[PDB]
Amino acid sequence: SMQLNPESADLRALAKHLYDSYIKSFPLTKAKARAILTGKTTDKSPFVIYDMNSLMMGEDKIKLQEQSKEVAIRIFQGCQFRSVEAVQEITEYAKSIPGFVNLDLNDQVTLLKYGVHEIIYTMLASLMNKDGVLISEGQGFMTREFLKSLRKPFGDFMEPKFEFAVKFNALELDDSDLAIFIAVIILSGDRPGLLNVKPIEDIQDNLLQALELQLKLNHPESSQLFAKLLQKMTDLRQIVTEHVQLLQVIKKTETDMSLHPLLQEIYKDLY
Ligand SMILES: CN(CCOc1ccc(C[C@@H]2SC(=O)NC2=O)cc1)c1ccccn1
């Protein structure tokens, strides 16, 4: 039913704008990650962390009393620091979404508070294959089974993210698709405590039309892909819920556990 009209031309311009700002905001794109993971890159191989020995060499190779801490806690704290960096990137990307910076600044903050973890887990899939995940902007690669070997209660925190990634990656989205997918998530009008829902819904409705057109153009091999991505949005909310519960369980049994204060603020009323 697709047409070349002014409306479709505007949706393509919006897709391109979003792609261009995504490239500016996120230094390690899915294209560059896939090239590293396949070896197809001309870059030096990342340092592979597959066991305790290679974890410690990695800490020398990859460029106070935190180092004192046990391996599992140094890794968990590394993931938290990654997430704080990602929040900065996603914030800069959100400001590029047309209409976002004209929303009420409280609503901008609310959308980022409730959206950032869904986007973090989306983009973490770009850096994953069935064996492991890229770390330190592609300088390292940490194996799935090494992460599973960490002592309880830290042996299971990456497993749901890998499970998500294997299925998400089978959809073969590229960075032009992901730019629009992430924008749609950020512009969710059902986040708690939003002042002005209708202007958020208006922006999301337009992004959703831009996403459906992008997917029909870019993926002739599937007519199901738009529907499947709507389901992945709901799946991501359950991944974040499942992570919040895991942090509850970690905290009871590991009460010495330092959570980054920025993440403590984001997690406050996050369910
Ligand atoms: C496994 N990797 C890749 C990043 O993997 C991540 C896993 C989980 C998160 C979410 C964090 S962890 C938490 O409790 N809250 C958060 O926001 C963010 C990144 C490592 C491992 C060590 C050092 C750096 N990278």
Tell me how the structure was determined: X-ray
* Structural domain for 27, as ranges: 1-271
Position 39: which residue type?
G
Q: How far is CA 70 from the centre of its chain?
A: 27
DSSP designation for 69:
S
Coil, strand or helix: which one is 135? strand
Q: Please state, as a whole number, how many other Cβ atoms lie within 10 Å of the Cβ of residue 231.
A: 10
By three-state DSSP, how is residue 4 classified?
coil
Distance CA 254, CA 257 (A): 6
Which residue do the tokens 């010495």 mark?
256
159 C-alpha to ligand 1 centroid (Å): 12
Question: Is the separation of the CB atoms in 100 and 206 below 8 Å?
Answer: no
Strands, E assignment, 23-139: 47-49, 128-129, 132-135
Which residues are bridge partners to 47 per DSSP?
140
Q: In what order do the strands lie in the sheet with 128-129?
A: 47-49, 140-143, 132-135, 128-129
177 closest CA partner among 122, 108, 235, 237: 122
Candidate from 59, 83, 239, 258 with most ligand 1 atoms within 8 A of CB, to mutate: 83
Nearest atom within ligand 1 for CA of residue 78:
23
Is 117 annotated for ligand binding? yes
Query: Closest residue (by CA) to atom 13 of ligand 1?
Result: 80
Within 8 A by CB and 6+ apart from 226, the residues are 211, 212, 215, 216
User: Kindly report the CA angle at 187 between 183 and 190, in degrees rounded to 5?
Assistant: 145
3-state secondary structure of 205: helix
DSSP 101: G
Gapped junctions in the chain, after residues (C–N > 2.5 Å): 63
The Cα–Cα gap between 116 and 228 comes to 21
Q: 150: Cβ–Cβ under 8 A, 6 or more apart, which residues?
A: 71, 72, 75
Q: Which of 36, 239, 22, 236 is nearest to 134 (CA)?
A: 36
- Using a 10 angstrom Cβ sphere, with 0-12 exposed, 13-18 middle and 19 or more buried, the burial of residue 74 is middle
Q: Which atom of ligand 1 is nearest to the CA of 86?
A: 18
Q: How far apart are the first and last CA of the chain?
A: 40
Q: How far is the CA of 78 from the centre of ligand 1 (A)?
A: 6
Pocket around ligand 1 at a 6 A CB cut-off: 75, 78-80, 82-83, 117, 120, 124, 133, 135, 142, 158, 247, 263
Burial of 55 (0-12, 13-18, 19+ CB in 10 A): middle
Spatial distance between the Cα atoms of 144 and 131, rounded to a whole number of angstroms: 6
Minimal-distance CA residue to ligand 1 atom 11 = 80
Q: What are phi and psi of 135, to 5 degrees?
A: -130, 160
Cβ contact 89:26 at 8 Å: yes
Crossing angle, helix 197-218 and helix 6-25, to 10 degrees?
Answer: 90
Q: Are 163 and 236 in contact (CB under 8 A)?
A: no
Task: Evaluate whether 199 touches 103 at the Cβ level (below 8 Å).
Answer: yes
Take atom 1 of ligand 1 and give the residue whose Cα is closest.
Answer: 79
Distance 121 CA to ligand 1 centre (A): 9
Q: Report the domain count for the chain.
A: 1
Residue 81 assigned to a binding site: yes
